[PDB]
Write a protein that binds this ligand. Structure first.
Ligand SMILES: NC(=O)C1=CN([C@@H]2O[C@H](COP(=O)(O)OP(=O)(O)OC[C@H]3O[C@@H](n4cnc5c(N)ncnc54)[C@H](O)[C@@H]3O)[C@@H](O)[C@H]2O)C=CC1
Ligand SMILES: NC(=O)C1=CN([C@@H]2O[C@H](COP(=O)(O)OP(=O)(O)OC[C@H]3O[C@@H](n4cnc5c(N)ncnc54)[C@H](O)[C@@H]3O)[C@@H](O)[C@H]2O)C=CC1
Ligand SMILES: NC(=O)C1=CN([C@@H]2O[C@H](COP(=O)(O)OP(=O)(O)OC[C@H]3O[C@@H](n4cnc5c(N)ncnc54)[C@H](O)[C@@H]3O)[C@@H](O)[C@H]2O)C=CC1
Ligand SMILES: NC(=O)C1=CN([C@@H]2O[C@H](COP(=O)(O)OP(=O)(O)OC[C@H]3O[C@@H](n4cnc5c(N)ncnc54)[C@H](O)[C@@H]3O)[C@@H](O)[C@H]2O)C=CC1
Ligand code: NA
Ligand code: NA
Ligand code: NA
Ligand code: NA
Ligand code: NA
Ligand code: NA
Ligand code: NA
Ligand code: NA
Ligand code: NA
Ligand code: NA
Ligand code: NA
Ligand code: NA
Ligand code: NA
Ligand code: NA
Ligand code: NA
Ligand code: NA
Lengths: 321, 324, 324, 321
């Protein structure tokens, strides 16, 4: 027979469990929840299985502590890692501090994907995102087009939300992109913001939003992750990160050809190669099918190149490991 | 006790039945299917009721030949009318030719709305769309913001589909608008076409699509209704018209603040007033909450003005029929 | 690279188009609409393509007059045929009368499936259903588990709807089955009717529904097809037939293991073999994975045997046409 | 205008946040997340708002520490309270130990519902469920039909899941009910289990499942809450509890007339009155529209009456407060 799709979630914490719930609600495929912690993914899997009955969907949800159970996965989504570095306060939280803790985890996961599901489409979530995806790609041996990082969909969702809220319109009808590194130097593309294709500038000219308000939204987008960390007190965002990754997974599973900003392997686009960084891309059944090369202005391109330089700096730290 | 929403579909032919099906699938509210043909809406309503059981939804679907059954409707969607004018060939099909048959229907429907459900949001579909919505509005007494015509969502869906197909991307990520009259002088706004906010021009510059291909798509969008009429042999398009109108209805029922191109009553925007014509609008729980005035170029403005002039010419026929 | 599922709809009339619409709304897979009428499926496919843009789904819909386009289909759903026999009145409508027109179509469709998509799961809808599925199976060469007919899901949806309406409860929470032939001798299984597993008898005992009312509903379920034919004036039911078949298709495509009454090839269950007839079955990625043999009472068993005998009598006509 | 539905979630912990996510995914209505903890519901609300943009839905999600913000709610769902008593181990976890901690919370919530949204349909989740709903009802002054507890949908979902898993069929097609108290004396109704109306007994006779396996499933259903507690290590189930409560809320909001097992105010049915206990009911726009009185056998009725006696014992402890 043609089996149900199989989705393995490597990491069964807040984002992993939430993604599993979306899979159950949407009947996307059977789900494997893997974690190094004993019993916990098994507990969540039972709870999730009961929820599938409530939803009238048909999904097996298995919890496991064994990598062998990811065999034959169509999609693998990786959240394995730490959310907040040990001896730091909330206000000084930085994704950069997670690097030493999480890089070795990406090596281990990569080696197991190589062994058990080398044909999977792999979405990396673990921070610091752009270099974690690079470590995963290197150690997994997967094709460049079959690995990417989730960040841009989340950052863009934030930009969209804030603009849509200010304009008081449906976020379906706001198009907004944030490109570059998933960090303080991410680049919200104000010039490309549209309302059903209508340039945001028209709304400025009509006084429906001011440049000052847009500037504030741009900074709020950059700081959104830390804003939520400060408010939650424990851990970081998970509802939107989970939804973002599942949007990418759906695009793959049903060959949708979505245009989504993801951390993608560059091969000369934007003047850069051999790193992952946030760029608009077409996502379908062949993974990252196309990186779209925006006609950035020199000012936007300078911001992007500065963003890439932050990834290069992090990559030096990876090399040092 | 808060009742289910009530949606009346005045006209139970191809578009009306198909809209009722979407209401059943989406569990939007209870449905009244009204038609002048005896028994037919009753039969469709039974079939649709059975389909709601299959969908595991909770919807009453009532077929009727009595206007009284529209009482208390939250939304009314009007498709009553002819699709093709008697004695005309398919090749010479024109929405204009439907005017003398369908205008009188709009007057009658308006009179009934005025007494039975004057607080409804009303979406007109019947052709020729922009003048039919005006007749309905005038004879119903409804506020300007509570009546509009479905056309732009359909015309835009076509423009979007053709662009998305050529670029091989999801239509979710193509934004395209067609404004003006729902007819041969509709205005597909090439300058405003975007792929997730990326200007279509960027794709031209990279040779992903040519200007010639875009020109062809613009014409194909204008001709799409007639294309389908010619292929089908019977009637006209209904799957996408139905979905378009239901998208508008959902925006109202759940106060979504969607930005949708609809035929709206103008009060000076674009330099025009007192007609309905296709413009981007924000649709929510107050109906047409805002008409958006695009910063059109002189060239686009001239295309729009010529489109409005086609509506004015049809309005002369409305006046001549004694229906103002 | 794993391709989208491919669903071919052989027949692009009322049921075929409506199924394509559900496929577009639900994003089930790419759709091929095949028909013998030139241009019509092409026109519907355009309309449906536009509707997919509105739905924000990602579906290719292809209209065609060539069987070659069914190559590689995961699922085929067959509605090709007549709905009403020439020269007969609506009041005397009988599915039986469609047999000599539709049997030859099943043979032709089978021959094409045999060469172009022999690994498809095939759902037959064309009437008279139980013998049409047998002709298709025989001439297609497919395994017994990979062909079935849609009828029981529709007949059960009707029984469910009528019971739920009388009890004023959600049809999601009414379980009702109709087994046997898809015709006047179908068997609505009153003893098996439940409300979330609660026997219908409990509602009788409390006077929520009477035996007389249940008897009326049983007859109404049997007569439902003809009731809709009489009301509509043109054709027959399509909204619920379409939804029924798509429910079956989904069970296959996502290996759901649904318990659905379908016309299935019997191999001794109920003491019968080598015909298709309506029985509860488990539907999943291996097609008809299991026929469930109900513990029928002697009285129920006699009703079922009489239903099977109606199928046997129609099969005599199939043989006489030279179509075995 | 006719405004969007408004759903207030009193308690913004695991179940509250999860319910909010379902509201956002399903576009059910605007959501207010209330908690006594500062900042946390505001953080979750931001995360959830970003997720609504991803989902292309149109939902306002507000976090608050002020009861005034529940004004005009169509539905209120209450999870405010403790999940596990302080000085007890996981294996000895009991919903009964939560009584002293959670009863006063129900009084406070009730008084605020009375003040700010007396016309709401109110679903109580806080344990010990059947007596917590009684305290809420008493102090809120709401009509008997406008308050109920979520338990039976969850317990029944578990029974359904386990049976469906054993039979290898879709849980949509298994009907199963658990009635009585939401506790160790809940009553899984084996005799009423059906597969699309087909009695489970037919499957026994055919050897597709044994009586021993059914007996094991009945006990597993009773112990399912504690099974998940033991596996998770922190807190209790939330994915299925959240989905169960939202199923009940949907039935109200769209007047669906669902037949759902809920903890309902009895007025003589089953020989009992003036308490809440788990019974099948019709849920629609008038709340609990009808309690369905099953034709229980004497043996089933004895189990039910014993279940009710457990509620009466808990009610004595409530009285003592
Ligand atoms: N835009 C983005 O890319 C975002 C990324 N993140 C990142 O996602 C990651 C996960 O976040 P949450 O799920 O909230 O964290 P969490 O702490 O709730 O879950 C992480 C899980 O990873 C597990 N884990 C640790 N080592 C492992 C190994 N070797 N193999 C398998 N599992 C292992 C832990 O046991 C834990 O259950 C973090 O690194 C976080 O910074 C979070 C939000 C957005
Ligand atoms: N974008 C747009 O605005 C579009 C508009 N249309 C128009 O929509 C209308 C309906 O199209 P279909 O549903 O395909 O046509 P249809 O012919 O299938 O159905 C029209 C129905 O109107 C009924 N009718 C006639 N007079 C009536 C009265 N006084 N009261 C109630 N019902 C009455 C009929 O008996 C018939 O059932 C046509 O005028 C067509 O041109 C169609 C496609 C797109
Ligand atoms: N429960 C059931 O099993 C039900 C079965 N039916 C049956 O389904 C069938 C279709 O019904 P509708 O879609 O409403 O009819 P319809 O008349 O709208 O469409 C039938 C289509 O079949 C086509 N056709 C004829 N010969 C063909 C060939 N050799 N190849 C391809 N296409 C061909 C037509 O040109 C027409 O478009 C009828 O036989 C009807 O009795 C209808 C309702 C329920
Ligand atoms: N079938 C059922 O009825 C089930 C019931 N439960 C019960 O649901 C309740 C909540 O469970 P979770 O959400 O997992 O717990 P949680 O600990 O994650 O969340 C409880 C929230 O209530 C808040 N809270 C405490 N006092 C409050 C007050 N006076 N006003 C407003 N908020 C207040 C806390 O700050 C906390 O955020 C528990 O009592 C648990 O036993 C859990 C699972 C199933
Ligand atoms: Na791969
Ligand atoms: Na209509
Ligand atoms: Na119509
Ligand atoms: Na429109
Ligand atoms: Na327009
Ligand atoms: Na058009
Ligand atoms: Na047309
Ligand atoms: Na057109
Ligand atoms: Na078909
Ligand atoms: Na058809
Ligand atoms: Na069937
Ligand atoms: Na049957
Ligand atoms: Na029937
Ligand atoms: Na029929
Ligand atoms: Na019938
Ligand atoms: Na109330």
């Amino acid at each position: 027979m043609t089996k149900r799709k199989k989705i393995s979630l490597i990491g069964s914490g807040m984002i992993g469990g939430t993604m599993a719930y979306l899979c159950a609600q949407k009947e996307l495929g059977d789900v494997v929840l893997f974690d190094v912690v004993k019993n916990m993914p098994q507990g969540k899997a039972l709870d999730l299985s009961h929820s599938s009955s409530i939803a009238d969907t048909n999904v097996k949800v298995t919890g496991t502590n064994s990598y062998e159970d990811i065999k034959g996965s169509d999609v693998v989504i990786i959240t394995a890692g730490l959310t907040k570095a040990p001896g730091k306060s909330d206000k000084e939280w930085s994704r950069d501090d997670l690097l030493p803790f999480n890089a070795k985890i990406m090596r281990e996961v990569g080696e197991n994907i190589k062994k058990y599901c080398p044909n999977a489409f792999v979405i990396v979530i673990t921070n610091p995102l752009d270099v974690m995806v690079k470590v995963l790609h290197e150690h997994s041996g997967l094709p460049k087009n079959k690995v990417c990082g989730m960040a841009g969909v989340l950052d863009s969702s934030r930009f969209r939300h804030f603009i849509a809220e200010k304009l008081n319109v449906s976020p379906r009808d706001v198009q907004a992109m944030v490109i570059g590194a998933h960090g303080d130097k991410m680049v919200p593309l104000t010039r490309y913001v549209t309302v059903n294709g209508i340039p945001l500038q028209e709304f400025i000219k009509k006084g429906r939003i001011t440049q000052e308000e847009i500037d504030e939204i741009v900074e709020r987008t950059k700081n959104a992750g830390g804003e939520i960390v400060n408010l939650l007190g424990q851990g970081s965002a998970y509802f939107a990160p989970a939804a973002s990754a599942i949007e990418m997974a759906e695009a793959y599973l049903k060959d949708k050809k979505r245009v989504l900003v993801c951390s993608c392997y560059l091969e000369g686009q934007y003047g850069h190669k051999d790193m992952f960084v946030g760029v608009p891309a077409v996502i379908g059944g062949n993974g990252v099918e196309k990186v779209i090369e925006l006609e950035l202005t020199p000012e936007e391109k300078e911001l992007f190149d500065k963003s890439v330089e932050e990834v290069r700096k992090l990559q030096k730290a990876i090399k040092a490991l």
